[PDB]
Amino acid sequence: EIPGFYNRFKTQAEKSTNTGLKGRLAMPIRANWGDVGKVVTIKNDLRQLKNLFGDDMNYSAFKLGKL
Amino acid sequence: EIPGFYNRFKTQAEKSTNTGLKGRLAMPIRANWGDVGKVVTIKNDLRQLKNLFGDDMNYSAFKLGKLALLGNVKELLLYRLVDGNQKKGTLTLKDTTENSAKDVIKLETKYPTARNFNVTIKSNLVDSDKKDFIFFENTKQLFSSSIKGTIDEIVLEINSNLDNEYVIATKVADSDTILANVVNQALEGGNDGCTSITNESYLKALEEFERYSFDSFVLDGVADEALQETTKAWVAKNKELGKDILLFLGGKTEDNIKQINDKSKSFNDENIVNVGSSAYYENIKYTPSEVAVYIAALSVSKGITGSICNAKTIFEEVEPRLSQSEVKECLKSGTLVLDFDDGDVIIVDDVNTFKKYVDDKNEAMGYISNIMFINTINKDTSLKRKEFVGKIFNDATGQTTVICALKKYFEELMSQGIISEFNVDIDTELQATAKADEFYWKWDAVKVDVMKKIYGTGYL
Amino acid sequence: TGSICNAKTIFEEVEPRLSQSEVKECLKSGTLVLDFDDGDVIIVDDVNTFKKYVDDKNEAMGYISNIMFINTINKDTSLKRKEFVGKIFNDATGQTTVICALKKYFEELMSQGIISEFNVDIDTELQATAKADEFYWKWDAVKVDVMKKIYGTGYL
């Protein structure tokens, strides 16, 4: 680069981390909503499940995902 | 010098000083009066603003300047916006000795304008050849003078006294003849400054503003959308170029709180602050951008060692007015909105438009004070560039000197209490990969917080 | 013991004025152009016209300070010519004396910190092929660099 003193700040995840989670699980699911024909990874926030596959407890998807 | 005991007294500013001001602000302005095409710095005395840009509240210049000055900015930097047709007022004078009268003096306003600056010339009652030159604005007299009937001395006197600073006199011909009498003749031919002002004028003003350094920008108290995206891109460019400029914005008065929140969602760069609430100060309303001028001014005046989350405002009323649900909606949207928590108008919080997002750019980045802190650190560091770049040899000694200087700076910050904890060290991870002509370094810190929320529990 | 890549200039204005793209274009072209990085006029970099080419004449040769260093070494060495040429017998003693003098000079340079590492020795490859009335010698060095670029990363 050109000479100079160019800062690039990286307070991304300074101390916003916790180690209370582990493992990964497979899930065939019936769902009223969400993507079809693909294996999608869901982070442990249930909001992600609610967004990507709906919030209907009548279906295996949301109920088993919450469990 | 020659031998002797020569005193030179320096009771200039012995104890005539106070420390109640800080910060600097940028201002594109429309004005009826004042300099054009230059970025002029204004000290916080409003008399300076009144002198250099007039006292007309119909124009963005004086009104937004007064708001910024009440924001307690140390130095307010202005720029007069105009269309190319914008022009100075002018008047011409003629002799009377000759039957074929010839123009001999022309009067032109010192600054471009369209106001009714008027002039009167009459026969002097004491001396025969003298003419009494008097100047007005809508018959409100500015200055009076009397000079004999020679054109050179007349124009020299008219240009000499700064009481006649509103107008410049120039000689049209080298006559020694008696001038013609005029009575309250306006300096016509001028054009105002609100004439056909468009986005291109603001773009040119911003390009002029690229020269300087600022703590904040507010964009003339105008909420035009295309100007807002243009200024957003401009500030992003300035940030990438190492100029850390903060931007405040205010939505249109017609926008509902939902629309304001949508706009505050659209903006997500940390250097963008969207203002929703309108207000009254002297029983006169202010659009969200006009009060965005004031909130930016107050923020920069606060500087470090402060915030705005409950700073009292000068405004006597605020609207639209929000329940706690609406306030929470606006804060979640990143909108900043004033509030009437008490009999005065009070700023609700320190939020910016970015606050809609959370984790990578941390939640403190959602607050304006943290951004001001980071910009200040970047600015002081980019001041250190010239001290250290190209002047020390990259050896262990040079690296140690740089680290020691940065440590001294951060310890100065610690002494002020702004930082609760810090460490600064060489970035040995990147220093291993660093080329021989460069240096990498790392630092952690913990800015000292402020009470926004407080809770009490009682036992009896 | 210095450079020009950010030396402040006496000039109150500079033109034509360049964005980072234009600056990078000029540096890649080997052009040297002043800049207005702050309220003063500042020299952008240490580049020379050669810098367009890269590897054989190394990238440091693209910088003027390295050329000044090399010219200074050549000048001091060509000053030593008159001390050593035609005045010492090419035996092991004369070669050792020449090498010791050059080592003393380079150690003086090391004391100033200009060089981070060096070695100077007889060029035994060419000395084997050398005619009896001549001498060959070799030296490696590492000039001490200067910060042109600096990068910082922050944690809060």
For residue B402, give the amino acid letter: V
Whether the CB-CB separation of B179 and B94 falls below 8 Å is answered with: yes
Q: What residue has token string 């450079």? A: C3
**Sign of the dihedral through C-alpha B400, B405, B406, B410:** positive
Residues followed by a break in chain C (C to N exceeding 2.5 Å) are none
Angle formed at CA B156 by CA B151 and CA B161, multiple of 5 degrees? 135
DSSP assignment, residue C52? G
For residue C122, what is the enclosing H or E element? Answer: strand C115-122
**At B292, phi and psi to the nearest 5?**
-65, -35
Q: What share of chain C is helix, strand, coil (3-state, %, to 5)?
A: 40, 20, 40
Tokens coding B11: 């009771």
Cβ count near B106 (within 10 Å): 16
DSSP state of C59: G
Which residues, including other chains, have CB under 8 Å from residue A15's CB and lie 6 or more apart? none
Residues B370 and B364: beta-carbon distance below 8 Å: yes
Q: Which residue has the tokens 């040769």?
A: C61
CB within 8 Å: C149 and A7: no
Side chain identity at B238, as an amino acid letter?
N
Task: Please name which of B334, B351, B298, B294 lies closest in space to residue B318, comparing C-alpha atoms.
Answer: B294
* Experimental method reported for this structure: cryo-EM
CB contact under 8 A, B430 and C147: no
Compare CB distances from C149 to A4, A10, A11 and report the shortest one's residue.
Answer: A4
> Residue B391 and residue B403: Cα distance in Å, rounded?
15
State how far residue B389 is from chain A, nearest Cα, in angstroms.
7
Token digits of residue C97: 């004396």
Which helix (H) or strand (E) segment holds residue C25: the answer is helix C20-28
H/E segment holding residue C116: strand C115-122
Residues B362, A14: C-beta atoms closer than 8 Å:
yes
**C154 and A7 in contact by Cβ < 8 A?**
yes
Q: Give a three-class secondary structure readout of chain B.
A: CCCCCCCCCCCCCCCCCCCCCEEEEEEEEECCCCCCCCEEEEECCHHHHHHHHCCCCCCHHHHHHHHHHHCCEEEEEEEEECCCCCCCCEEEEEECCCCCCCEEEEEEECCCCCCCEEEEEEECCCCCCCEEEEEEECCEEEEEEEECCCHHHHHHHHHHCHHHCCEEEEECCCCCCCECCEEEEECECCCCCCCCCCHHHHHHHHHHHCCCCCCEECHHHCCCHHHHHHHHHHHHHHHHCCCCCCEEEECCCCCCHHHHHHHHHHCCCCCEEEECCEEECCCCEECHHHHHHHHHHHHHHHCCCCCCCCCECCCCEEECCCCHHHHHHHHHCCCECEECCCCCCEECCCECHHHHCCCCCCHHHHEHHHHHHHHHHHHHHHHHHHHHCCCCCCCHHHHHHHHHHHHHHHHHHHHCCCEEEEEEEECHHHHHHCCCCEEEEEEEEEECCCCCCCCCCCCC
Residues in A closer than 8 angstroms to C27, CB to CB, are 2
Q: Which of B430, B439, B447 sits opposite C147 (nearest CB)?
A: B439
User: What HEC string does B77-88 produce?
Assistant: EEEEECCCCCCC
Q: How far is C150 from chain A (nearest CA, A)?
A: 4
List the beta bridge partners of residue C46: none
Which chains sit next to A, with 3 or more Cβ pairs under 8 A?
A: B, C
CB B23 within 8 A of CB B74: yes
Beta strand C149-155 with A4-7: parallel, antiparallel or unpaired?
parallel
Residue C142's H or E segment, with its range, is: strand C137-143
The residue assigned the tokens 């931007």 is B247
Cβ-contact C5, C45 below 8 angstroms: yes
**Nearest in space to B182 (alpha carbons), one of B137, B125, B123, B142:** B123
Positions of chain breaks in chain A, given as the residue before each break (C to N > 2.5 Å): none
Q: Which residue on chain A is closest to B361 by alpha carbon?
A: A12
CB pair distance less than 8 Å for C152 and A14 = no
* Other beta carbons within 10 Å of B273: 29
Tell me which residue in C148, C151, C153 faces B390 most closely, judged by beta carbons: C148
Beta-bridge partners for B425: B442
Neighbours of B21 (CB within 10 A): 14
What whole-number distance in Å separates Cα of residue B174 and Cα of residue B176?
Answer: 7
Residue B216, phi then psi, degrees to nearest 5? -160, 165
Residue B460 contacts by C-beta under 8 Å, 6 or more apart in sequence?
A: none
Tell me the backbone φ, ψ of residue B208, rounded to 5 degrees. -60, -40
Which residues from A are below 8 Å from B when comparing CB atoms?
A: 3-7, 9, 11-14, 16
Which site among C8, C69, C156 would you substitute to test the B interface, given the most B Cβ atoms closer than 10 Å to its Cβ?
C156
Residue type for position C120: V
Resolution of the PDB structure in angstroms: 4.1
Amino acid sitting at position B450: V
Q: Helix, strand, or coil here: C8?
A: strand
Residue B118, beta-bridge partner list = B136, B186
Of A7, A12, A13, the CB nearest to B381: A7
User: Quick one: CA dihedral B385, B387, B390, B392, positive or negative?
Assistant: negative
If you compute the radius of gyration of chain A from its CA atoms, what whole number of angstroms results?
Answer: 19
Beta strands (DSSP E) in A1-67 are: 4-7
**Which residues pair with residue B120 across a beta bridge?**
B134
Burial status of residue C96 (CB atoms within 10 A of its CB: 0-12, 13-18, 19 or more): exposed
Phi/psi at B332 (nearest 5 deg)? -60, -35
Reduced to 3 states (helix: H, G, I; strand: E, B; else coil), residue A45 is coil
Q: Are B61 and B71 in contact (CB under 8 A)?
A: no
Burial B214-223 (b: 16+ CB within 10 A, else e): bbbbbbbbbb
Query: Long-range contacts for B397-402 (Cβ within 8 Å, ≥24 apart)?
Result: B397/C113, B398/B439, B398/C147, B399/B426, B399/B439, B402/B439, B402/B441
Of B112, B118, B117, nearest in space to B59 by CA: B112
Q: Which of B436, B439, B446 is opposite residue C150, by nearest beta carbon?
A: B439
Residues of C in contact with B445 (CB under 8 A): 154-156
Q: A11 to chain C, minimum CA–CA distance in Å?
A: 5
Q: A13 and B359: CB-CB below 8 Å?
A: yes
Of A3, A7, A16, the CB nearest to B362: A16
If you measure CA to CA, which chain C residue comes closest to A6?
A: C151
The answer to whether the Cβ–Cβ distance between B389 and C150 falls below 8 Å is yes
Tokens representing B376? 């200040």
Which residues in chain B have their CB less than 8 angstroms from residue C32's CB? Answer: none
**B74 Cβ partners below 8 Å, 6+ apart?**
B21, B22, B23, B24, B44, B301
Report which DSSP code applies to C85. Answer: T
The C-alpha atoms of residue B290 and residue B57 are separated, in whole angstroms, by 12
- Under 8 Å between Cβ of B423 and B444: yes
Q: Which residues of B touch C (CB under 8 A)?
A: 241, 362, 364, 370, 374, 377, 381, 385-386, 388-395, 397-398, 427, 430, 435-447
Q: What's the CA gap between B115 and B130, in Å, rounded?
A: 28
Task: Nearest by CB to A2, from C20, C152, C153: name it.
Answer: C20
d(CA B107, CA B118): 10
| Neighboring chain B residues of C146 at a CB cutoff of 8 Å | 390-394, 437
Contact B268, B357 (CB under 8 A): yes
Inter-residue contact B444 to C155 (CB < 8 Å):
yes
Gap between the Cα atoms of B10 and B363, Å rounded: 51
Q: Which residues contact B323 (CB under 8 A, 6 or more apart)?
A: none
Q: Is residue C28 within a helix (H) or strand (E), and if so which, with residue range?
A: helix C20-28
**How many CA atoms lie less than 13 Å away from C41 in the CB half-sphere?**
12
Nearest to B119 by CA among B105, B136, B104, B132: B136
Nearest CB partner across the interface for C44, out of A2, A8, A10: A2
CB atoms within 10 A of CB B203: 15
DSSP state of A59: S
Provide the Cα torsion C106, C111, C115, C117; round to 10°: 80
Which residues partner with A4 through β-bridges? C149
Measured in Å, how far apart are chain C's first and last C-alpha atoms?
Answer: 38
Distance, CA of B30 to CA of C23 (rounded, Å): 35
Task: Report the C-alpha gap between B39 and B213 in whole angstroms.
Answer: 12
Tokens 């800015």 -> residue: B447
Q: How far apart are CA B386 and CA C7, in angstroms?
A: 8
For chain A, first and last CA: distance in Å? 52
Contact indicator for B388, B441 with CB cutoff of 8 Å:
no
B365, B372, B393: best to mutate for the C interface, most C CBs within 10 A = B393
- Calpha distance B225→B241 (Å, rounded): 24
